[PDB]
Every structure is written in structure tokens, then in C-alpha cells.
Amino acid sequence: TFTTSEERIMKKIYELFEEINQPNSIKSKVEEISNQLKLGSMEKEKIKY
Amino acid sequence: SLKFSKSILSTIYLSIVLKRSNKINNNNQNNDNNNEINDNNIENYENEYSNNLVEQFLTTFFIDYNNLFIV
Amino acid sequence: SELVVSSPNGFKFAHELSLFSEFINKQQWRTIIEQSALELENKNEYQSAIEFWIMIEEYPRVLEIYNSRISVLLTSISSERDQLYQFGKQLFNDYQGRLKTTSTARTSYLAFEQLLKLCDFFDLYNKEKYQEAIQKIENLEILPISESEIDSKVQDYRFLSPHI
Amino acid sequence: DVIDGYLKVQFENIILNTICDIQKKTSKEFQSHYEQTSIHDWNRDKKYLEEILGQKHIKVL
Amino acid sequence: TSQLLDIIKIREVLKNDFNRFSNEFEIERELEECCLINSSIQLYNSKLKALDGWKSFINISLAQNTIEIDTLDESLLLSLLQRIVIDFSNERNPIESTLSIGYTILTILFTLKLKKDSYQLFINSSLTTNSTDSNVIEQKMKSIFEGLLQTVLKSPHQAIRGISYTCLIQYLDLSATTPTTPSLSPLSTSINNVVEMNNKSKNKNNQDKEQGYGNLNIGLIISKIEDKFIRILSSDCNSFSRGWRITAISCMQSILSIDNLCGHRSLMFLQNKGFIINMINDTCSKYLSDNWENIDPKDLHVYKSQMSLLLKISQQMDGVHLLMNNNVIGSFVKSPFLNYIPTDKIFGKFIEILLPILQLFASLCCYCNNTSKNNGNINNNNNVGGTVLIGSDRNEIYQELFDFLSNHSDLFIIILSDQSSFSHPTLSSLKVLKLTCFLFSKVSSLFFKKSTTTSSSTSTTSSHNRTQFNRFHYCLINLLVKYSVNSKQIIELVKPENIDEELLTEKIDFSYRKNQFQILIKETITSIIHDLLLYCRKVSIVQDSNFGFVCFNSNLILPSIDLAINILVDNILQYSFYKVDLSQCFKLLQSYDQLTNYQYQEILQTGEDYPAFGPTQRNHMVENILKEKIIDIETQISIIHENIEILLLLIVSHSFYFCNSLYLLFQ
């Protein structure tokens, strides 16, 4: 059978899976910053003096 | 349902366009005149309501549920 | 009104302001009396305030103040209780004609003519005159003397004033 | 002088807690009304001096 | 016991008096009827057995926390609660069965509160963007409330109403929303720039609708039933025995916290039934008469709940008016209890009865400030004559408080000297002192006037008023010495009086280390110093800005001006600390999902239970503890800024008074 500490660490393994995989996850945000980079949207103009 | 959806969106587009022309005209006339139950309240109420309605219509479109662009 | 209520002849001066009719028209005069009477109630000067409310014939407020201060004092062995009770016996002698006519404050007059008998009952109780005290509360009609009166007095009580 | 016997006590505990909650709640509400009152009194009694100081400043000129 | 028909004795008597019957097939049918009635009585008894089994099974399956409260499905629990609240409203109940259902309703509502106060409710239906699903949740919650009200309207049975009153309290504690976050004020924004007014309507026109609809649904239930519900409840508040009387009075307090949404109608209905004056007279005669020493401790909780209802009334504008329209201050001030000089063997019971009166009298001062917005936009004749408090009414309240404090003078001298022969002070003597200094700060301007009005008459009374003033003044000034200079020693000498305060004596504050009790003492001492400084300001600086009485003597007997300068420096230092500490609490609230396990122990402090709580549970508990502690700190930051302004004003006014007083010796 499970122990309360195994039920509880299995919960933490699920909680830390979802934050990585849901539509508003870490994975999504690291493709948008990558999309904005491919589409030049962070290359601010280099004024020179 | 897809006809009715097209017909909502085509009528919303037409009302936003007409509202955008009226807001341009009234934004001239609200400079020019200020330097030398009231039915006015109805236009102002329908002007905020027909902003917030279009805003709620677009949040209820974009904020699992398949985003209608997917479908 | 600050002048009239600070005056050590205030009632006499407020009456004299009824003669200066080219300086104070009678509506301004009545409202100087209204503001002076309220600014005597604000001092606990309930007798001074009553004589001011009498000066403008506002007999509802006269009965309202009198019943309110005498009910809160009714049973007390205090100088204010006996002073206000003799003042009430004067208001009963001389003003009862006017006080017994008003359309409003009718129940306030019934209560005034019950409180001026309840004070007379407690006068005799606090002086061991128990047979005369019994006769004062019998001749007040607020209690049952027999079992046959109980449902009547248990109804009559519902038409007293909230000062009894 | 004063399963199911333990359930009696648990139901009575729940009633006593539900009575205690409101008396603690009404007390934090009272504390907040007290402190907002002295804040309002200060800013009122402050402005009264700002206006009286104006009614003294002019008088020397 | 349960009775059945004796089919043997019946069959024998029917065969003795056979003379009534046409033949024996009639006798055997009258026995068939008895056998049918016994069969349905047996089935009635087994349905009652099964309820008593089912209730004890469920309440044990909840009241031991044997099911993890996170996993307990609110969609199932509300569907059960909605089902059984219908039978709890049935006038064909057993009393025993309706009570067995009622105690099961009570445990389900209490377990739902124990979910709310650890986790957000209904998360699975904010993770659906379904406006349908939150509509189904309101319709369930509403079907429970309109049902619990039917059980009150229908039932004659005290304990069935009493349980429904506990369930109605827990329902209103469930439906009340948590506080919004405080709105930080960027004080430097003084220059010209035009556009961003007009967009600010929209977002409040949403969140004020969305909190609005639930509260308006409760208000649009109460405001259909009102005349019967408040009538039954105000009867029960005086018709019930002891424990359930308290439950009805607590229910009335919870309803008055919502009566604003009906329009103060429950409050107005109570005056339109004499309930306020009748409860004042029920209070003074039974708990504030000469026999107060002999009050039964079971009904001292009836006193505390009656006083907490007067305290809940004085927390409203119309409620302060309605308490003065029943002479509340004057009708408590006439009562024998207040004449009693307390002696050591009884002092705690005197404080338990004096403290709620001083809370009520302080509460009556609060509303008398809102007169200042009279922008004359004339148009419409809505003649609703609501009594905006007049220039009379705050002076009426302050006069009954002046003549209270001045008749009871030797009791208030014993309170205001704080000559504590009790070899430890307590937090409840400080609760009483916080209220006493506030009342003298409020009434201070009448204390100046009634001691300085020189009439051309009785010199023997104006000297007496000024002798009482001098006694109170030296006590209030010596408190400002004791509580500022020995401030730190007092925080190190005070003891708890209750297990609630021992549980604040173990617990640390994460902003401060101290325990939480040593902060609640300290912030009670901030309060004592603040209204003592307001008293000093109102006594040093008079109308017209003339100087009054000297609070601090010239030197660098009264104390000297070193005291005001040291209090100013310590308040400037505390104002600098709380602004760093607020700048920590807002940083914690901006990173709560990224705090260390040690910071989560530093904030939650939940013993060896701290391991058990899940992350989403800890994060929600910390997010609401940080909301509370930001509001506590932003409040103390106001009080201590205002101390700094009061102290600067006191130092400048005394310095100016002495410089003019010296100049007037050189002409």
C-alpha cells in the first residue's frame, strides 16, 4: 500500500508536472519568447554616438 | 449556427465602424465649442455599454476549451 | 439665541424680543425661541426649555419633554424629581386648558395626567402613607383590582404611553 | 452543575466555535472603526489649525 | 418505546364480544387491519433506525478529518446539503429525525468552512471558463439558504431553529468574500498629465457587479421575508433558553453585518418593535445591578453576546442615532455597577463587564465625522429625511460622556493613574486603558470649557470643575510618561489571561524576534500614546489658536519638553522600521510561490503539522496572512505618522508659548 508521505510526494510529482505542461506553462512561454526572437521583435534599434 | 455567427460578426463590425466615424466627428466638435431626463445620457450609456459588450464578447472568445480559430 | 440662552434674564429677554417687531419679524422671533429652546434641552435645562416652548404655544413638545424627564426621575428621591413635580403641578393648574386641547400629543396628555398621579403615589409610599398610596394607584385605572379585570388591563396597557 | 456521545460534544463544539467566530469578527471590525476614527479626527483637527494660522499670518502686514 | 397492537388480546376480546359482528370473517378482517397497521409501524421504526445509523456514519466520516479536506468534493457535498435541507424544512418530520438531519447539515457546513479557510473553494469551476458552472453553484447555495429560512419560518421547535441559526451563520461566513488587496498610493504624482481618468469605470463596473450579485441575491431573499424572519428571530433572542438565546443573538449580529444591503431595515424593524430599548433594560437590570458579583458564568455569555449586538449596532450611522434615541449612555451610566471601586479578589470579573461598555461608548463617537461633502447639485425632490448628524448631536454624545466621566471621577482616577498594585499588568487592563484614553481625547474640549467658563455666580463650583480637571490632567500626563519611557519594560512585564493569548505568546511575527502577544501589547500601547497625544494637542492648543494648559514644562511638577522630543525620535524610528517591514511584506506577496520552506515555516508556524499541508494550501494561507499583515502595518504607519505631526505641533506650540511668556517680562 501507499504511505501518507508517498501519497503526498506523488501529489508533488503531479503538481510539478502540470506547471510544465498546461497551455499557460513554462513550455508555452519559452516558445513565445522564441517566436518573438525569430520575428525580430526584441532587436531594438542601435542608435550610435 | 455558422451563418448566425457570420451575421453577428458582420453586424458588430458595421456598428464599430459607424461608432468610429461618430467618435471622430464628436472629438472635433468637443474642442471647437469650449473657448468663448437628458437624452445626452442615453448616447453616453449606449457608448460605454457598446464598448464593454464588445470587450466581454472578445474575452469570452479568447480567455480545455478549443479557441474558435482552432474549431 | 446664543445671547438669549446666555442671558441671566433669558425668558424675560426672549419675551421683550417680541416687542422689537420692527427689528425682529414674528417668524424670526418664533425661530429664535425654537433655537433657544433646543439649546436649553442641549443643557438639560428641561424647565427653561418648557417655558420657551410655551412662549410659542408648541404644547406637543411641552408634554413630550415633561413626560420624558419625569418618567426617568419618577421613583427617585431627588431634588430635580420634586422640583420638576411642583413645576408639573403648575403646568397642570394653569396650562391644562391648552394642553387638554391638542390633536397630536393627546396620549402625552393622558400620560401627563397619569405621571402627576404616579408621583403622588410614590410621594405617599416614600412617606409610609400606604393606605393613601393604595387609594392613589386604585384611582389611576392602570392595575386590575379583581381577576375579572385582568384581560381588560392586559389590553389597556397596550394603549398607555412608553413613560408608564 | 451541568459513536453518539462523542458526536454530541462535536456538535456542541461546532456551535460554540460558530458563536466565538462572530464575537472575534465584530471585535476586529470595532478595532478598525476606532483607528479610522482617530485618523479622521486628526486630519479634521489638523486642517482647523491650517485655517486659523491663515487667519493670523495676514494680520502683521 | 414503540407500541404495536396485541393481535392475541384483540382476537380474544373480539371473540368474547362477538355480538357486534355479522360473522367471524369480519373479526378476522379487523385483525387483518391491525396486522397491516403493525407492518407499517414496523417499517416506520426501521426507516428511523436507518436514519440514526446513516447520520452517525456520516458525522464520524467527517468529524475525525479521516477524508483529506482538499479531496472532499464540494459538488457532491452541496448536492447532498441541497437534498437534505428540503426534508429539514418538512412539517411532517419526527423531531428526532429532523434534529439528526440538522446536526448533519451543521457538520457539512462546518467542513465546508474548514475547506474555505485552508483552500480556495470551487477551483475546478474557475478552471472551467463556464459561466454555467458558477451559476449552478450559486443556484445550489441559494436553494440551501431559502430552505434554512423555511425551517425557521415553519418550525415551533427551539433546537431545530437553533441549529438552523448556526447553519445560517456558517452559510453567511461561507458566502462572504475575502478582502481585496490594498491599493498602493503613488504620492508624488502632482503634474498636469491628462488622459487616464476615463478608462477607470470599466473594471469596477465588473468586480462591483460580481461581488454585487451574490450579496444582492442574499438581500433580495431577506427583503421578501424580513417582517416575519426578523420578527421570529427577535422573539427567539428573548424567548429562548440560555445557550440557544446566544445562537439567536449571534445570528442577529451576522444579519446586521448584511442589513446595509437591504437598507438598514432589520435595524429599523428592531426599533419599530422596541427591541433595542427592551434589550438595554434587559442588560442594565440583570448584569449591571448590585448583584453583578453573583452573575452565573453560563449567562455571562448571554451578557457578552447582548453587548456584542449593541457593539454591532453602533458600527452603523443610523445605529449610533438609534442608540442615542434610546438614551444608551445615560441608561448604562445610571446603573449601580459603575459606582463600584474594584478590589483584588474580584478585579477580573469587573474588567469582563466594564470592557464591553467602554467598547460600546467608544463606538458611539466614531460616525460623527462625515458632514463635509455638501456640493449643491439641486435637481430632484427625493425627500428621504435621513438624519445627518448635526452640530448638536456630537456635543450631546460628548456631554453624556463628560458628565459620566465627571460623576464617576474616582473610578476613572483609579483607572487613569495606572498605579497597578497587581504585580503584573494584563492585556485586558490595557484593553480598558486604550478605551479610557480615547474617551478623554474625544471629550477633552469640554474638559477645557467646563473648567474655564467663569460665570459671575458660584465661585465654589467653577473651582471644583477645575480641581477635577487638574486631577484628570496630571493622571493623563503621567500615563504619557509611564507608557512612553517604560514602553519596552511593559511589553516585557504583561502576561496573557487566556489560552488565545498563550497561543499568541508561543507564535513569532515574521516581520519582527518578538512573539505576536508582545506586538498586540505594543500596538495597544501605540493606541494609548496616540489618543493621549490627541488629548495633549486639544488641551495645549485652544480655539482661535490661543494656548491652553501646559503639557510639557520649559526645561532642556509637569514633565519637561525632553519627553516630547524623545517620543518624536522613537516614533520617527518606528515609522522608518514599519516602512522597511512593509517593503518586506509586499516583496513576500510579490514572490509567495518562490519562498523557501523555511520562510513558509517562518510565516505559517503550524508546529509539526507544517509537513501535512499541500503547496496550494500553504500558498493560499500565506497569501491571506500577508494581506492581513500588510493592512495591520499600513494602519500602524498612519497612526505613527500622525503621532509625528502631533509631536512637532506640541513642541512648536510649547516653545512659542515659553518664548512669548519670557518676552512679556522685558517691557
Curated annotation (Swiss-Prot), chain A:
Domain of life: Eukaryota
Localization (cell): Nucleus, Nuclear pore complex
Cystine crosslinks: none
Transmembrane portions of the chain: none
Domain commentary: Contains FG repeats.
Family, similarity comment: Belongs to the NUP54 family.
Function: Probable component of the nuclear pore complex, a complex required for the trafficking across the nuclear membrane.
Name recorded for this polypeptide: Nuclear pore complex protein nup54
Organism annotation: Dictyostelium discoideum
Residues of the full protein shown: 344 to 392 of 440
